[PDB]
Amino acid sequence: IKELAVDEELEKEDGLIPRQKSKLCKHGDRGMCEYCSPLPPWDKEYHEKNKIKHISFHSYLKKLNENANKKENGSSYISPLSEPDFRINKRCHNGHEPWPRGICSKCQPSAITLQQQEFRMVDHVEFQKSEIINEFIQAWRYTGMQRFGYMYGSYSKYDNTPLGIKAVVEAIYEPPQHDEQDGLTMDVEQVKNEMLQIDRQAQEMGLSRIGLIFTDLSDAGAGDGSVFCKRHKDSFFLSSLEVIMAARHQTRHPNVSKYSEQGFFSSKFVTCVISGNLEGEIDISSYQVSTEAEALVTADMISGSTFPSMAYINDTTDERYVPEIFYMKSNEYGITVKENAKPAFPVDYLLVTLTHGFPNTDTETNSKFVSSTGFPWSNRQAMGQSQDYQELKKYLFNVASSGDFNLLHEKISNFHLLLYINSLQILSPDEWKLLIESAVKNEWEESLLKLVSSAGWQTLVMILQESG
Amino acid sequence: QIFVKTLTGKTITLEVESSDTIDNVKSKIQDKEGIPPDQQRLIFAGKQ
Ligand SMILES: [Zn+2]
Ligand SMILES: [Zn+2]
C-alpha cells in the first residue's frame, strides 16, 4: 500500500538530537558514554523543556518500532499500531459463544483509566493569509448569527517540532446551513451531497478537506468590548455536542498507513473554533480529538448531556455493553483515587491541543490563493453576497474591457470563482483542467495566452457582455 | 559447641501508576507553546 508523500519523508529521517561534551563526561574526545550520546526524538523530557506538550507521533512510531523489532530473531513484522477496540468479539474463543448467555474477561472491555494521549497526529496548524479568515468573521458581522465552514489544505514538514507534520490550509468552503443565535444544526444529507462535487475539483487543484471551523462569539455590548469570554479554565473547552460532529468527521476521513493492520490509522484532521481570548480580542484556538479511547466509543456510546463540559453515558440494550469510566478529582478534604460511579463524565480530558499561527508577511514559500478574497462565496445566502452573473460584470469583467495579463491572471486564481465557473460547464473539462492548473501553478504566462486564444474564453466574455 | 541457622524471605513490590488529576490537566490546556519566528497570532475588531 502507498501512504502520503509527507508521511513517507518523516519515516525515513531518524531525527536524532545531537549533544556536546560536558564536565560530567569522563571518556575521551573520540567517544560518548551517556551524557553526549545522541538523544532519541521520543523522549518527553526534552519535549517539556522546550514547552512541547506532545511527543510528535512519527517519533512515537519510532518508539514502538524499537519494541516491535528487536536485536533477537523475531521474524514477525507485527508492528502493533492499531486502534484499541472496546467492542465485544462475538466468537470469543471460549465456551460462552453467545453474548446474551455468557461473557468472560478476555472479551470484556476493561475499565477506562482515562489516561491522556501523549502524541498528536497534527502538531501545528498554520494558515495562509489573515484576509482569508477575515471574510469568515465578516459573515457574522452582517447577519449576527453563527457560521460554519470546511477547510481545504495540504501538509508539509515542520522543523520546530522534532519529527512533526504541520497543517497548511488554503481556502475555506461553507456548506448551506440554517443559522441560529444560540447554536446551529444542519442536515447531513444535503451537505454530503454537496461535498461530493467539491472533492472532484479539489483533486485536480491539489486540495483535500482536512478541517472545519465554527464560530462562537457572543458580543458583549458592541462598543468598547469585542466579545464575551465563554471558554476559559473554569468553563468548558469544547462542548460535548461538538465532540460528536468532530468524531464523525475523523471516521469519514481515514489516514493511510502501512504499519497498521487494517490499512488505516491515526487520522490527520483538525477542528478549529473561533471563541476569543480571555481579556479583549477574538483570537482563535484549535484542538483535535483523541484516537486512543474517544475515536472508537463514538460509534456506540456517546450521549448528549445538559452540561457542556460533560457527556452522559447511557445503558446497555442487549448488544451495547460498556465498561465503567473512572477519573481522579479532588474531594472536599484531600485528593483521592478514582470516584466515578456516576454518569456525566467530562470530555475536556479527551482533547489534545494544537498551536495555531499565521506566517510572516515579509517572506514565504508561496501563498497560491491570494486573488482578492472579496468575491461572493458560493453558499452565503444569509449575507447579501450570493449574486448571479451580475457579479461577474463587477468582479473581473476582463478589466476595463481590455485587460493586461499581469492584472488579469492575479484575479483568476480565486478558489470560489473557479468553483463557480465550472458549475455552468461552458468550457470543456480538458480546457477547464488546464485553466485551474494555470491559476494555481507558476510559469503561467505561456499557458494564459493559450487560454485567451481558445474559443471557450471568447464565448464566456461574449455571453457576459450581453447579459447584465 | 553448636550452631543456629535460619534463612529469610522477601516480597519485592506491586505498583498501580495512577496520576494526572483533572485540575492539573485543565491548567495544562490553557497555555502557549511558542511560535517559530514570524507566526503572529492576530487580534481583529468589528461589530460597531
Ligand atoms: Zn559522554
Ligand atoms: Zn471471550
Short mmCIF file of C-alpha atoms and ligand atoms in Angstrom, two decimals:
data_model
loop_
_atom_site.label_atom_id
_atom_site.label_comp_id
_atom_site.label_asym_id
_atom_site.label_seq_id
_atom_site.Cartn_x
_atom_site.Cartn_y
_atom_site.Cartn_z
CA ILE A 1 0.00 0.00 0.00
CA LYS A 2 1.13 3.61 -0.57
CA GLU A 3 1.00 6.35 2.06
CA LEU A 4 1.18 10.12 1.60
CA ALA A 5 4.27 11.87 0.24
CA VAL A 6 4.63 13.81 3.50
CA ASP A 7 4.23 10.71 5.69
CA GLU A 8 6.99 8.77 3.92
CA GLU A 9 9.50 11.61 4.31
CA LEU A 10 9.11 11.72 8.10
CA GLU A 11 9.62 7.95 8.30
CA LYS A 12 12.99 7.91 6.52
CA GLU A 13 14.64 10.59 8.67
CA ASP A 14 15.80 9.48 12.11
CA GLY A 15 15.53 12.95 13.67
CA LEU A 16 18.24 12.47 16.29
CA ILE A 17 19.17 15.32 18.64
CA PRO A 18 22.93 15.97 18.94
CA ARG A 19 24.64 16.86 22.20
CA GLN A 20 28.03 18.33 23.12
CA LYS A 21 30.79 17.38 25.54
CA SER A 22 30.34 18.17 29.22
CA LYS A 23 32.18 18.32 32.53
CA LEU A 24 30.41 15.13 33.64
CA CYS A 25 31.95 13.13 30.78
CA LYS A 26 34.99 11.07 31.80
CA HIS A 27 35.61 9.45 28.41
CA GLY A 28 37.91 10.67 25.67
CA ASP A 29 37.11 13.16 22.93
CA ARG A 30 36.54 10.39 20.36
CA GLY A 31 33.57 8.80 22.07
CA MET A 32 30.39 9.17 24.10
CA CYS A 33 29.39 7.48 27.33
CA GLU A 34 25.86 8.60 28.20
CA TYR A 35 25.92 12.39 28.53
CA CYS A 36 26.81 13.25 24.91
CA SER A 37 25.11 10.27 23.28
CA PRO A 38 22.51 11.10 20.59
CA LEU A 39 19.14 11.76 22.21
CA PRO A 40 16.08 9.87 20.93
CA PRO A 41 13.35 12.04 19.36
CA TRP A 42 10.60 10.47 21.50
CA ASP A 43 11.93 11.40 24.95
CA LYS A 44 9.30 13.55 26.67
CA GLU A 45 11.88 15.12 29.00
CA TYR A 46 13.31 17.14 26.10
CA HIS A 47 9.75 17.94 25.00
CA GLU A 48 8.56 19.69 28.19
CA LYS A 49 11.90 21.52 28.44
CA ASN A 50 11.02 23.44 25.26
CA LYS A 51 7.31 23.51 26.34
CA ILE A 52 6.27 20.93 23.76
CA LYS A 53 3.38 19.03 25.33
CA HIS A 54 3.25 16.06 22.92
CA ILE A 55 5.79 13.64 21.51
CA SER A 56 5.24 14.05 17.71
CA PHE A 57 3.59 10.73 16.62
CA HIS A 58 6.16 9.92 13.90
CA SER A 59 8.64 9.73 16.78
CA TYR A 60 6.07 7.73 18.74
CA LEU A 61 6.04 5.36 15.76
CA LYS A 62 9.81 5.05 16.24
CA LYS A 63 9.49 4.27 19.96
CA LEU A 64 7.14 1.36 19.16
CA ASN A 65 9.38 0.10 16.35
CA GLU A 66 12.08 -0.45 18.98
CA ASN A 67 9.60 -2.58 20.94
CA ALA A 68 8.35 -4.45 17.85
CA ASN A 69 11.69 -5.04 16.12
CA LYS A 70 14.44 -6.19 18.48
CA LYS A 71 18.00 -7.48 18.26
CA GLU A 72 16.62 -11.03 18.60
CA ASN A 73 15.21 -13.16 15.78
CA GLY A 74 11.52 -12.28 15.92
CA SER A 75 10.76 -12.99 12.23
CA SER A 76 7.33 -11.40 12.72
CA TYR A 77 6.95 -7.81 11.41
CA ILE A 78 3.91 -7.34 13.63
CA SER A 79 4.10 -3.53 14.03
CA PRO A 80 1.36 -3.17 16.70
CA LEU A 81 -0.12 0.16 15.58
CA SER A 82 -3.86 -0.50 15.65
CA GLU A 83 -6.97 1.10 17.08
CA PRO A 84 -7.67 -0.37 20.55
CA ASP A 85 -11.14 -1.90 20.43
CA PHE A 86 -13.85 -1.64 23.08
CA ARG A 87 -16.41 -3.66 21.10
CA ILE A 88 -17.13 -7.26 22.07
CA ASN A 89 -15.93 -10.18 19.97
CA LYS A 90 -18.90 -12.49 19.46
CA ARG A 91 -16.98 -15.71 18.80
CA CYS A 92 -14.90 -15.13 21.99
CA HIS A 93 -12.67 -18.26 21.54
CA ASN A 94 -14.29 -19.96 24.55
CA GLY A 95 -17.46 -21.73 25.68
CA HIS A 96 -19.58 -18.59 26.10
CA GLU A 97 -20.36 -18.39 22.40
CA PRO A 98 -23.38 -16.01 22.62
CA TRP A 99 -23.09 -12.69 24.45
CA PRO A 100 -26.80 -12.99 25.60
CA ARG A 101 -25.60 -16.08 27.53
CA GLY A 102 -22.01 -15.56 28.68
CA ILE A 103 -19.10 -13.13 28.86
CA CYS A 104 -15.62 -13.68 30.30
CA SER A 105 -12.63 -11.43 30.92
CA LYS A 106 -10.72 -11.95 27.66
CA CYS A 107 -13.54 -10.39 25.60
CA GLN A 108 -14.87 -7.96 28.21
CA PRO A 109 -13.75 -4.34 27.69
CA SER A 110 -11.58 -3.22 30.59
CA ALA A 111 -12.37 -0.20 32.75
CA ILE A 112 -11.23 3.00 31.05
CA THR A 113 -8.45 4.55 33.14
CA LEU A 114 -8.78 7.95 31.38
CA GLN A 115 -5.11 8.48 30.65
CA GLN A 116 -4.31 11.44 28.40
CA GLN A 117 -2.81 10.91 24.95
CA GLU A 118 0.87 11.82 24.81
CA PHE A 119 1.07 12.02 21.00
CA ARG A 120 -0.85 14.12 18.49
CA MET A 121 -1.19 13.43 14.77
CA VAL A 122 -1.12 17.07 13.63
CA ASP A 123 1.44 19.03 15.64
CA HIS A 124 0.91 22.62 14.47
CA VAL A 125 -1.88 24.08 12.36
CA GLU A 126 -0.87 27.03 10.19
CA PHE A 127 -2.76 29.38 7.89
CA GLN A 128 -2.07 31.22 4.64
CA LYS A 129 -3.44 34.76 4.99
CA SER A 130 -5.19 36.91 7.60
CA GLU A 131 -7.55 38.24 4.91
CA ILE A 132 -8.96 34.75 4.25
CA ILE A 133 -10.45 34.16 7.71
CA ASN A 134 -11.36 37.86 7.99
CA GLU A 135 -14.15 37.20 5.49
CA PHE A 136 -15.38 34.37 7.73
CA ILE A 137 -15.78 36.67 10.75
CA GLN A 138 -17.28 39.31 8.43
CA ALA A 139 -20.17 36.90 7.77
CA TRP A 140 -21.03 37.20 11.46
CA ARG A 141 -20.73 41.00 11.28
CA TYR A 142 -23.56 41.20 8.72
CA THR A 143 -26.18 38.67 9.88
CA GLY A 144 -25.33 38.48 13.60
CA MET A 145 -25.58 34.67 13.67
CA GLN A 146 -23.02 31.87 13.86
CA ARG A 147 -21.41 30.33 10.78
CA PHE A 148 -19.87 27.06 9.62
CA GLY A 149 -17.24 26.02 7.12
CA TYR A 150 -14.82 23.38 5.86
CA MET A 151 -11.09 23.94 5.40
CA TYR A 152 -9.26 22.66 2.32
CA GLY A 153 -5.49 22.41 2.53
CA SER A 154 -2.36 20.28 2.40
CA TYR A 155 0.56 19.12 4.57
CA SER A 156 4.33 19.57 4.72
CA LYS A 157 7.23 19.20 7.15
CA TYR A 158 7.72 21.12 10.41
CA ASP A 159 11.25 21.82 11.65
CA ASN A 160 10.34 23.37 15.03
CA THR A 161 8.84 20.18 16.49
CA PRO A 162 11.21 17.17 16.18
CA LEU A 163 9.73 14.86 13.51
CA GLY A 164 6.47 16.79 13.22
CA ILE A 165 3.98 17.50 10.44
CA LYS A 166 2.44 20.96 10.11
CA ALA A 167 -1.05 21.59 8.72
CA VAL A 168 -1.41 24.18 5.95
CA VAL A 169 -4.83 25.43 4.81
CA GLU A 170 -5.54 27.24 1.54
CA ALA A 171 -9.27 28.02 1.25
CA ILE A 172 -12.49 27.68 3.24
CA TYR A 173 -15.75 26.36 1.79
CA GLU A 174 -19.08 26.99 3.52
CA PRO A 175 -21.93 24.47 3.23
CA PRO A 176 -25.56 25.65 3.16
CA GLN A 177 -26.75 25.72 6.77
CA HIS A 178 -29.56 27.19 8.86
CA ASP A 179 -28.09 29.77 11.23
CA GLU A 180 -29.31 30.45 14.77
CA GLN A 181 -28.34 32.80 17.59
CA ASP A 182 -27.74 30.13 20.24
CA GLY A 183 -26.11 27.40 18.16
CA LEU A 184 -26.50 25.68 14.78
CA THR A 185 -27.69 22.36 13.35
CA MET A 186 -27.82 21.46 9.66
CA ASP A 187 -28.88 18.42 7.65
CA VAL A 188 -26.07 15.95 6.99
CA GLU A 189 -27.63 14.63 3.77
CA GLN A 190 -27.53 17.84 1.72
CA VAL A 191 -24.02 18.63 2.98
CA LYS A 192 -22.65 15.22 1.96
CA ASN A 193 -24.29 15.53 -1.47
CA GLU A 194 -22.74 18.99 -1.83
CA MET A 195 -19.30 17.96 -0.56
CA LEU A 196 -19.05 15.15 -3.14
CA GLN A 197 -18.70 17.54 -6.08
CA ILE A 198 -16.22 19.82 -4.27
CA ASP A 199 -13.94 16.81 -3.78
CA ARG A 200 -13.92 16.39 -7.57
CA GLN A 201 -12.42 19.83 -8.23
CA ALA A 202 -10.10 19.53 -5.22
CA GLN A 203 -8.28 16.58 -6.82
CA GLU A 204 -7.03 18.47 -9.89
CA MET A 205 -6.23 21.57 -7.82
CA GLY A 206 -4.34 19.52 -5.22
CA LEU A 207 -6.67 20.20 -2.29
CA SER A 208 -8.16 17.99 0.41
CA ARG A 209 -10.85 18.60 3.02
CA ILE A 210 -8.85 18.27 6.25
CA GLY A 211 -10.52 20.81 8.52
CA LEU A 212 -13.63 22.65 9.62
CA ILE A 213 -14.45 25.83 11.54
CA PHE A 214 -17.45 27.01 13.56
CA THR A 215 -17.93 30.35 15.30
CA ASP A 216 -18.90 31.22 18.87
CA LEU A 217 -18.62 34.92 19.71
CA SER A 218 -21.42 36.31 22.00
CA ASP A 219 -20.72 40.04 21.52
CA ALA A 220 -20.92 42.00 24.77
CA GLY A 221 -22.24 45.48 24.01
CA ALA A 222 -20.88 46.31 20.51
CA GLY A 223 -18.95 49.29 21.92
CA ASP A 224 -15.60 49.12 23.70
CA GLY A 225 -15.76 45.37 24.32
CA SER A 226 -15.31 42.91 21.47
CA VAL A 227 -16.82 39.62 22.74
CA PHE A 228 -17.63 37.84 25.97
CA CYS A 229 -15.32 35.20 27.43
CA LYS A 230 -17.25 31.93 27.31
CA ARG A 231 -14.46 29.33 27.14
CA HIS A 232 -11.95 29.61 29.98
CA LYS A 233 -10.30 27.37 32.58
CA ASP A 234 -13.34 27.05 34.85
CA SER A 235 -15.77 26.64 31.93
CA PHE A 236 -15.80 24.11 29.08
CA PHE A 237 -13.09 24.00 26.43
CA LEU A 238 -15.19 22.14 23.84
CA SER A 239 -18.91 21.44 24.15
CA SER A 240 -19.95 17.78 24.17
CA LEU A 241 -22.34 18.30 21.26
CA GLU A 242 -19.44 19.42 19.05
CA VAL A 243 -17.36 16.41 20.10
CA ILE A 244 -19.88 14.25 18.20
CA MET A 245 -19.51 16.28 15.00
CA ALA A 246 -15.72 16.18 15.37
CA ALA A 247 -15.74 12.40 15.89
CA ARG A 248 -17.83 11.55 12.82
CA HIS A 249 -15.64 13.75 10.61
CA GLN A 250 -12.47 11.90 11.61
CA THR A 251 -14.00 8.48 10.94
CA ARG A 252 -15.13 9.53 7.45
CA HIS A 253 -11.58 10.62 6.51
CA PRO A 254 -9.01 7.95 7.45
CA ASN A 255 -5.25 8.27 7.07
CA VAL A 256 -3.48 5.51 5.15
CA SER A 257 -0.58 3.81 6.96
CA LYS A 258 1.40 0.70 6.04
CA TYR A 259 2.21 -0.05 9.69
CA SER A 260 -1.44 -0.59 10.60
CA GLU A 261 -3.02 -4.00 10.06
CA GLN A 262 -6.37 -2.63 8.86
CA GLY A 263 -4.66 -0.27 6.40
CA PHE A 264 -5.77 3.00 8.02
CA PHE A 265 -4.86 4.60 11.36
CA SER A 266 -4.12 7.97 13.01
CA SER A 267 -6.41 10.32 11.09
CA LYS A 268 -4.98 13.79 10.37
CA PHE A 269 -7.96 16.07 10.94
CA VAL A 270 -8.15 19.49 12.61
CA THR A 271 -11.06 21.15 14.41
CA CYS A 272 -10.69 24.91 14.87
CA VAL A 273 -13.10 27.16 16.78
CA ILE A 274 -13.40 30.95 16.91
CA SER A 275 -14.05 31.74 20.58
CA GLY A 276 -11.95 34.72 21.69
CA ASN A 277 -9.26 35.21 24.30
CA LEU A 278 -9.71 35.91 28.00
CA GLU A 279 -9.20 39.68 28.00
CA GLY A 280 -10.29 41.52 24.88
CA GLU A 281 -9.90 40.01 21.41
CA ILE A 282 -11.30 37.33 19.09
CA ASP A 283 -8.16 35.17 19.00
CA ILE A 284 -8.87 31.61 17.87
CA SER A 285 -7.75 28.22 19.14
CA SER A 286 -7.83 24.65 17.86
CA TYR A 287 -7.89 21.23 19.48
CA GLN A 288 -8.26 17.79 17.92
CA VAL A 289 -9.81 14.66 19.40
CA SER A 290 -8.01 11.65 20.89
CA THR A 291 -7.66 8.36 18.98
CA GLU A 292 -6.99 6.03 21.94
CA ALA A 293 -10.43 5.97 23.60
CA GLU A 294 -12.79 8.58 22.15
CA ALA A 295 -12.45 7.61 18.48
CA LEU A 296 -13.97 4.13 18.84
CA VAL A 297 -16.60 4.64 21.55
CA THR A 298 -18.29 7.31 19.42
CA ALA A 299 -19.72 4.56 17.19
CA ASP A 300 -21.85 3.15 20.02
CA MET A 301 -21.65 5.12 23.29
CA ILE A 302 -21.71 8.91 23.25
CA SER A 303 -24.91 10.55 24.51
CA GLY A 304 -25.66 14.22 24.99
CA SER A 305 -25.83 15.80 28.44
CA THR A 306 -27.15 19.13 29.67
CA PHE A 307 -23.66 20.19 30.80
CA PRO A 308 -21.20 21.47 28.16
CA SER A 309 -18.16 20.08 29.98
CA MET A 310 -19.51 16.53 30.42
CA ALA A 311 -21.39 13.90 28.43
CA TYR A 312 -23.91 11.34 29.65
CA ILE A 313 -23.20 7.61 29.48
CA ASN A 314 -26.29 5.59 28.58
CA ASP A 315 -27.26 1.98 29.35
CA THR A 316 -26.81 -1.40 27.61
CA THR A 317 -29.58 -2.85 25.42
CA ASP A 318 -28.50 -6.43 24.55
CA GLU A 319 -25.52 -5.54 22.33
CA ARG A 320 -24.13 -2.24 23.62
CA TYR A 321 -22.06 -3.35 26.60
CA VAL A 322 -19.92 -0.55 28.03
CA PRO A 323 -17.31 -0.61 30.82
CA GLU A 324 -17.10 1.77 33.75
CA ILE A 325 -15.36 5.11 33.23
CA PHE A 326 -13.10 6.38 36.02
CA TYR A 327 -11.20 9.62 36.62
CA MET A 328 -9.49 11.33 39.55
CA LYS A 329 -10.71 14.54 41.17
CA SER A 330 -10.27 16.31 44.49
CA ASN A 331 -12.84 15.92 47.27
CA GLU A 332 -13.72 18.44 49.99
CA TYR A 333 -10.77 17.42 52.20
CA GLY A 334 -7.97 15.99 50.03
CA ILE A 335 -7.04 14.41 46.72
CA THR A 336 -8.48 10.91 46.30
CA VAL A 337 -8.29 7.96 43.91
CA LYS A 338 -10.95 7.29 41.17
CA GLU A 339 -14.50 8.10 42.26
CA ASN A 340 -16.67 7.92 39.15
CA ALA A 341 -19.58 5.55 39.71
CA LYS A 342 -21.74 8.33 38.28
CA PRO A 343 -22.65 9.45 34.74
CA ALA A 344 -21.81 12.75 33.00
CA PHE A 345 -18.02 12.28 32.79
CA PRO A 346 -16.03 15.21 31.34
CA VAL A 347 -14.89 15.36 27.72
CA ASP A 348 -12.23 18.07 28.08
CA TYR A 349 -9.76 15.35 29.13
CA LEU A 350 -10.02 13.60 25.74
CA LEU A 351 -8.76 16.61 23.74
CA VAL A 352 -5.16 17.24 22.71
CA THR A 353 -4.10 20.80 21.93
CA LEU A 354 -2.56 22.40 18.85
CA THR A 355 -0.51 25.54 18.14
CA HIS A 356 -2.16 27.86 15.64
CA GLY A 357 -0.35 30.69 13.89
CA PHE A 358 -0.05 32.91 10.85
CA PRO A 359 3.18 33.29 8.82
CA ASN A 360 5.18 36.47 8.40
CA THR A 361 4.23 38.88 5.63
CA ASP A 362 7.78 39.68 4.53
CA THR A 363 8.57 36.25 3.03
CA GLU A 364 7.04 32.83 2.38
CA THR A 365 7.45 29.85 0.09
CA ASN A 366 4.14 30.55 -1.74
CA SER A 367 0.55 31.50 -0.96
CA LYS A 368 -1.19 30.17 -4.10
CA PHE A 369 -4.69 31.58 -3.49
CA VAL A 370 -4.49 35.34 -2.75
CA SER A 371 -6.53 36.86 -5.56
CA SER A 372 -8.99 39.23 -3.89
CA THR A 373 -10.69 37.28 -1.07
CA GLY A 374 -13.66 39.59 -1.71
CA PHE A 375 -15.59 37.53 -4.23
CA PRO A 376 -19.10 36.49 -3.13
CA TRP A 377 -18.93 32.98 -1.70
CA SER A 378 -20.99 30.08 -3.00
CA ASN A 379 -23.40 29.32 -0.14
CA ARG A 380 -23.55 32.66 1.72
CA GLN A 381 -27.30 33.11 1.30
CA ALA A 382 -27.72 34.68 4.74
CA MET A 383 -25.45 37.51 3.62
CA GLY A 384 -26.01 39.61 0.52
CA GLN A 385 -23.00 38.15 -1.33
CA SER A 386 -24.80 35.37 -3.21
CA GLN A 387 -25.08 37.08 -6.59
CA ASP A 388 -25.79 35.83 -10.11
CA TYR A 389 -23.90 36.79 -13.33
CA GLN A 390 -24.38 40.47 -12.37
CA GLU A 391 -21.35 39.99 -10.09
CA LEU A 392 -19.13 38.76 -12.95
CA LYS A 393 -19.56 42.13 -14.67
CA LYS A 394 -18.45 43.75 -11.42
CA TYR A 395 -15.74 41.34 -10.25
CA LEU A 396 -13.48 40.54 -13.21
CA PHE A 397 -15.11 41.93 -16.43
CA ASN A 398 -11.79 41.29 -18.34
CA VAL A 399 -10.81 44.52 -16.66
CA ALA A 400 -11.80 47.79 -18.40
CA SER A 401 -12.80 45.66 -21.45
CA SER A 402 -9.09 45.19 -22.33
CA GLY A 403 -7.05 43.62 -19.54
CA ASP A 404 -3.32 43.28 -19.04
CA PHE A 405 -2.16 39.72 -18.38
CA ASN A 406 -0.34 40.73 -15.19
CA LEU A 407 -3.62 42.19 -13.86
CA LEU A 408 -5.94 39.53 -15.32
CA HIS A 409 -4.21 36.39 -14.01
CA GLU A 410 -3.99 37.79 -10.48
CA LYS A 411 -7.79 37.74 -10.20
CA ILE A 412 -8.36 34.33 -11.81
CA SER A 413 -6.68 32.29 -9.04
CA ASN A 414 -9.62 32.58 -6.61
CA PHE A 415 -10.98 29.35 -5.15
CA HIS A 416 -14.70 30.20 -5.18
CA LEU A 417 -14.53 31.97 -8.55
CA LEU A 418 -13.13 28.86 -10.25
CA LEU A 419 -15.71 26.70 -8.46
CA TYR A 420 -18.47 28.97 -9.78
CA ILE A 421 -17.32 28.84 -13.42
CA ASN A 422 -17.23 25.05 -13.88
CA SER A 423 -20.73 24.66 -12.41
CA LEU A 424 -22.04 26.30 -15.58
CA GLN A 425 -19.65 23.93 -17.51
CA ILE A 426 -19.35 26.16 -20.56
CA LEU A 427 -15.75 25.12 -21.24
CA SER A 428 -14.58 21.60 -21.96
CA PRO A 429 -13.33 19.56 -18.96
CA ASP A 430 -9.92 19.28 -20.63
CA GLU A 431 -9.69 23.05 -21.13
CA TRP A 432 -11.02 23.65 -17.61
CA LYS A 433 -8.33 21.44 -16.04
CA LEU A 434 -5.57 23.45 -17.70
CA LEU A 435 -7.39 26.63 -16.65
CA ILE A 436 -7.27 25.83 -12.93
CA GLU A 437 -3.72 24.46 -13.21
CA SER A 438 -2.57 27.72 -14.81
CA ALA A 439 -4.03 29.77 -11.96
CA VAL A 440 -2.55 27.68 -9.15
CA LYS A 441 0.94 26.95 -10.53
CA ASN A 442 3.94 29.06 -11.52
CA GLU A 443 5.25 29.99 -15.02
CA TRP A 444 1.68 30.76 -16.06
CA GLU A 445 2.44 33.32 -18.79
CA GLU A 446 2.85 30.86 -21.67
CA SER A 447 -0.34 29.00 -20.76
CA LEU A 448 -2.51 32.05 -20.03
CA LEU A 449 -2.13 33.17 -23.66
CA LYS A 450 -3.32 29.69 -24.64
CA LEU A 451 -6.50 30.32 -22.64
CA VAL A 452 -7.29 33.69 -24.25
CA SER A 453 -6.72 32.27 -27.75
CA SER A 454 -9.24 29.48 -27.14
CA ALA A 455 -12.82 29.92 -28.35
CA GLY A 456 -14.25 28.92 -24.97
CA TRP A 457 -12.93 32.00 -23.19
CA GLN A 458 -14.15 34.17 -26.07
CA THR A 459 -17.68 32.79 -25.67
CA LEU A 460 -17.52 33.43 -21.92
CA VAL A 461 -16.79 37.15 -22.31
CA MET A 462 -19.33 37.45 -25.14
CA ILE A 463 -22.19 35.86 -23.19
CA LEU A 464 -21.30 38.08 -20.21
CA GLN A 465 -21.35 41.38 -22.11
CA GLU A 466 -24.89 40.96 -23.46
CA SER A 467 -26.22 39.91 -20.06
CA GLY A 468 -26.42 42.34 -17.16
CA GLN B 1 29.65 -26.39 70.53
CA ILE B 2 26.59 -25.92 68.31
CA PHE B 3 25.04 -23.66 65.69
CA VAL B 4 21.93 -21.63 64.84
CA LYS B 5 20.91 -21.38 61.18
CA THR B 6 17.87 -19.52 59.84
CA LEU B 7 17.07 -18.20 56.36
CA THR B 8 14.91 -15.27 55.23
CA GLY B 9 12.32 -14.32 52.63
CA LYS B 10 11.26 -11.19 50.81
CA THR B 11 8.43 -9.65 48.79
CA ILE B 12 9.56 -7.23 46.10
CA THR B 13 6.80 -4.74 45.12
CA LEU B 14 3.49 -4.00 43.41
CA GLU B 15 2.56 -0.77 41.61
CA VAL B 16 -0.51 0.95 40.17
CA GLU B 17 0.90 4.00 38.28
CA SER B 18 -2.01 6.35 38.96
CA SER B 19 -1.56 10.05 38.19
CA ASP B 20 -2.93 13.03 36.21
CA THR B 21 -5.57 14.70 38.40
CA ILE B 22 -8.19 16.63 36.45
CA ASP B 23 -7.30 20.05 37.90
CA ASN B 24 -3.75 19.78 36.54
CA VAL B 25 -4.98 18.95 33.02
CA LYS B 26 -7.42 21.89 32.95
CA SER B 27 -4.47 24.17 33.69
CA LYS B 28 -2.41 22.22 31.14
CA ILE B 29 -4.69 23.16 28.21
CA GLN B 30 -4.84 26.95 28.72
CA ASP B 31 -1.25 27.90 27.94
CA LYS B 32 1.07 28.62 24.99
CA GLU B 33 3.82 26.60 23.32
CA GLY B 34 5.84 29.10 21.25
CA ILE B 35 5.81 30.09 17.56
CA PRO B 36 8.97 29.71 15.39
CA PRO B 37 9.80 33.30 14.25
CA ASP B 38 7.18 35.27 12.30
CA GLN B 39 3.99 33.34 13.01
CA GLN B 40 1.92 36.12 14.57
CA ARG B 41 -1.35 35.26 16.00
CA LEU B 42 -3.56 38.26 15.44
CA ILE B 43 -6.33 40.34 17.01
CA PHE B 44 -9.32 41.50 14.98
CA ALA B 45 -12.11 44.01 15.60
CA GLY B 46 -15.62 44.76 14.38
CA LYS B 47 -19.34 44.93 15.21
CA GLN B 48 -19.63 48.69 15.68
ZN ZN C 1 29.68 11.14 27.46
ZN ZN C 2 -14.45 -14.14 25.45
#
